[PDB]
């Protein structure tokens, strides 16, 4: 079997990597979910509705929470327009900078989180259950590429805001234990969460009009775990392994150029 058996070993190793990495990613996303849910839960059930209008207090809460959870990039507490007197927009937010923790009220100095351009606010103010945004560049606030998990707080029929957790995309490869150039993450609809190239994430990465990519593209469309090769735009052939994230049905794809996989083995 000789090049057939080398190939079968290559795929088994790739399957192990993508499976372990889908796993890391699962625990990371569930940790962010659980924490955002816990914070919206506390605010909704226990919070003093005039301790909560206190930016020094919210800044302390959010700093300690980011400081205590190394994997989180940032967290916000964002209120419906006019929740409180003399403020339209109010959204304390803390994020990790390379040297500390920065703070801003997004609604004063960052952006109008309610204007429709912001998934993390618009989708999420009444899912109740919580919601992941698509990948975006957090311009004016976090100023990096991220996805965010947002959860409404209050009670029926109208909640009065969301709390959020941001995950910086630049960190996923390390958190997943895969070199950036070998990692793609797709959401459940197959849209790009993570790619080495940042203009790809923001709208492209696989030519499906290419005969060689058909099996890889079906694998992606069927939303199944599996192995397949493919070519990129420069015509480099990769061997790739796709693993599913349980429940969310996001995908982790591990791919390494074939020349390189054969050279090591």
């Amino acid at each position: 079997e000789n090049y057939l058996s080398i190939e079968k070993r290559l795929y088994e190793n790739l399957a192990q990597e993508s499976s372990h990495s889908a796993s890391r990613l699962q625990f990371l996303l569930e940790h962010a979910q659980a924490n955002t849910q816990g914070l919206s839960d506390f605010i909704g059930l226990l919070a003093d509705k005039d301790d909560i209008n206190n930016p020094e207090k919210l800044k302390t809460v959010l700093t300690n929470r980011i400081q205590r959870n190394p994997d989180f990039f940032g967290s916000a507490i964002a209120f419906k327009p006019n929740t409180f007197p003399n403020k339209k927009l109010f959204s304390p937010y803390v994020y990790r900078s390379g040297s500390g923790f920065n703070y801003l009220d997004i609604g004063a100095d960052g952006y109008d989180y309610t204007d429709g351009n912001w998934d993390w606010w618009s989708k999420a103010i009444n899912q109740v259950g919580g919601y992941w945004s698509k990948a975006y560049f957090d311009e004016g606030a976090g100023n990096v590429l991220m996805i965010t998990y947002a959860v409404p707080f209050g009670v029926q029929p109208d909640y009065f805001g969301v709390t959020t957790v941001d995950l910086a995309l630049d960190r996923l490869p390390e958190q997943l234990g895969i070199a950036p150039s070998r990692l793609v993450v797709l959401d459940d609809q197959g849209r790009l969460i993570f790619h080495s190239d940042k203009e790809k994430v923001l709208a492209g990465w696989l030519d499906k009009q290419n005969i060689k990519n058909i099996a890889f593209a079906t694998l992606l469309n069927d939303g199944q775990a599996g192995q397949a090769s493919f070519v990129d735009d420069k015509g480099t052939v990769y061997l790739a392994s796709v693993a599913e994230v349980a429940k969310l049905k996001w995908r982790v794809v591990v791919m390494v150029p074939k020349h390189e996989l054969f050279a090591s083995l």
Side-chain angles (χ1 to χ4, degrees), residues 2-265:
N2 205 247
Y3 149 135
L4 291 183
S5 75
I6 285 170
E7 183 168 74
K8 176 201 154 107
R9 194 168 337 145
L10 294 174
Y11 273 129
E12 302 182 330
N13 293 348
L14 285 165
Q16 267 195 108
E17 282 172 35
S18 69
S19 178
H20 289 56
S21 278
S23 220
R24 309 202 167 105
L25 170 66
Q26 189 195 344
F27 289 108
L28 176 57
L29 295 175
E30 299 177 347
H31 180 208
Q33 295 168 13
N35 271 231
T36 309
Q37 293 170 3
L39 176 60
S40 288
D41 210 39
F42 316 157
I43 298 187
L45 293 163
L46 301 180
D48 163 62
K49 182 139 167 143
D50 60 291
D51 237 335
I52 216 165
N53 197 346
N54 176 336
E56 263 328 273
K57 283 183 209 315
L58 303 178
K59 171 160 170 302
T60 310
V61 173
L62 297 170
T63 302
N64 292 348
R65 134 174 203 110
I66 286 306
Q67 202 156 206
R68 302 206 264 238
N69 300 97
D71 288 315
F72 307 161
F73 177 75
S75 166
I77 298 178
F79 297 86
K80 254 187 167 79
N82 294 119
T83 302
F84 305 114
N86 305 149
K87 251 181 309 212
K88 200 155 155 310
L89 295 185
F90 177 52
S91 167
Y93 173 66
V94 172
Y95 68 94
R96 92 212 313 138
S97 67
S99 77
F101 303 97
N102 285 354
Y103 165 85
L104 69 157
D105 177 0
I106 291 183
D109 306 328
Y111 52 70
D112 177 2
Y113 49 88
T114 72
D115 66 0
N117 290 119
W118 300 97
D119 255 14
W120 71 255
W121 171 266
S122 297
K123 275 304 194 195
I125 188 49
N126 71 314
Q127 219 118 335
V128 170
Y131 167 75
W132 280 102
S133 68
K134 66 198 232 318
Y136 63 106
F137 180 52
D138 195 28
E139 168 140 276
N143 286 140
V144 301
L145 277 169
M146 59 184 203
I147 46 178
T148 126
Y149 189 74
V151 178
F153 55 79
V155 271
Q156 253 64 46
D158 311 7
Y159 304 110
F160 55 117
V162 305
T163 70
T164 65
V165 180
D166 299 338
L167 298 183
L169 306 191
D170 286 347
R171 293 186 64 188
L172 293 175
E174 166 174 31
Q175 279 161 324
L176 270 43
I178 306 298
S181 66
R182 317 180 163 199
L183 173 63
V184 168
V185 185
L186 298 176
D187 74 9
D188 50 301
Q189 298 293 147
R191 294 199 321 289
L192 231 31
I193 296 281
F194 183 81
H195 191 101
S196 271
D197 185 25
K198 303 316 153 164
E199 32 282 321
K200 296 179 177 325
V201 179
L202 261 27
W205 65 282
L206 188 68
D207 168 14
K208 293 181 221 194
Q209 283 317 307
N210 174 341
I211 283 312
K212 309 183 247 192
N213 297 342
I214 298 180
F216 189 47
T218 305
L219 196 46
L220 296 180
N221 301 332
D222 290 354
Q224 304 259 271
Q227 282 57 72
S229 54
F230 84 80
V231 314
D232 68 3
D233 324 320
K234 290 95 145 47
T236 310
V237 192
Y238 290 79
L239 269 45
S241 179
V242 174
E244 184 154 89
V245 180
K247 295 213 187 63
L248 292 157
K249 286 138 160 314
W250 298 14
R251 266 72 48 81
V252 165
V253 183
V254 180
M255 67 210 98
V256 185
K258 187 170 84 187
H259 56 79
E260 159 180 353
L261 289 172
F262 285 69
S264 314
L265 214 296

